[PDB]
């Protein structure tokens, strides 16, 4: 979800 979207975006 959005937390995961942020995890992916910042990788």
């Amino acid at each position, epitope marked *: 979800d*959005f*937390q995961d979207e*942020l995890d992916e*975006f910042f990788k």
Partner: antibody
Amino acid sequence: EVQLQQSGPVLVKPGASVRMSCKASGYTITDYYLNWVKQSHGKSLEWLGVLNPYSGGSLYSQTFKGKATLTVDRSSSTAYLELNSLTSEDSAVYYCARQLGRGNGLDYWGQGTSVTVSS
Amino acid sequence: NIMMTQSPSSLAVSAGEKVTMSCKSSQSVLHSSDQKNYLAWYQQKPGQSPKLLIYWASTRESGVPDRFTGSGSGTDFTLTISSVQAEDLAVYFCHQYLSSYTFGGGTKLEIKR
């Protein structure tokens, strides 16, 4: 020293669009993510989304999806926020604010751009 | 989203007094991969942009005076100013960045003299 220089205040009519800029200096713009945050009054902050200046891609709050568009010009180390379909409720100061990585706070904020939407 | 609530809305103290202010999240802000609470505090002085004070709920940002300390876990967080200085008047905001970023409504610290 680190600086984020934002463009000046603007007046725009309802229904119009506006683009504002945020120029990074004293550091390399690629090393930090760049967030945009609206302040509508002194006791309010609302996040719009975040730009990766290296790639040029962005992640947007669902609130601002299709309303805001983030871009970057790396040759001038300048990030941009465009807002469309403006209403009186979009009048606010808009800040750009850098963030090193996922787990970091927003460690340096620009001085803000005041946008007034009015007839 | 995760809702952030701050209390009190404002408070006033004389220079030298200790103050505590509260930030409550509607759910956990703990990030599992690093076991950090993704919770930041900012200070916004009148006419200035916000300044980052604390991140990870309790880690002080470089240059931030020792008098500012963040604490808490779960959904209950606190900012303490151990000995308030006249220049500390500001609105203090909390911020969660676990999910789509949200901010508290601010606590306005005023000075008595």
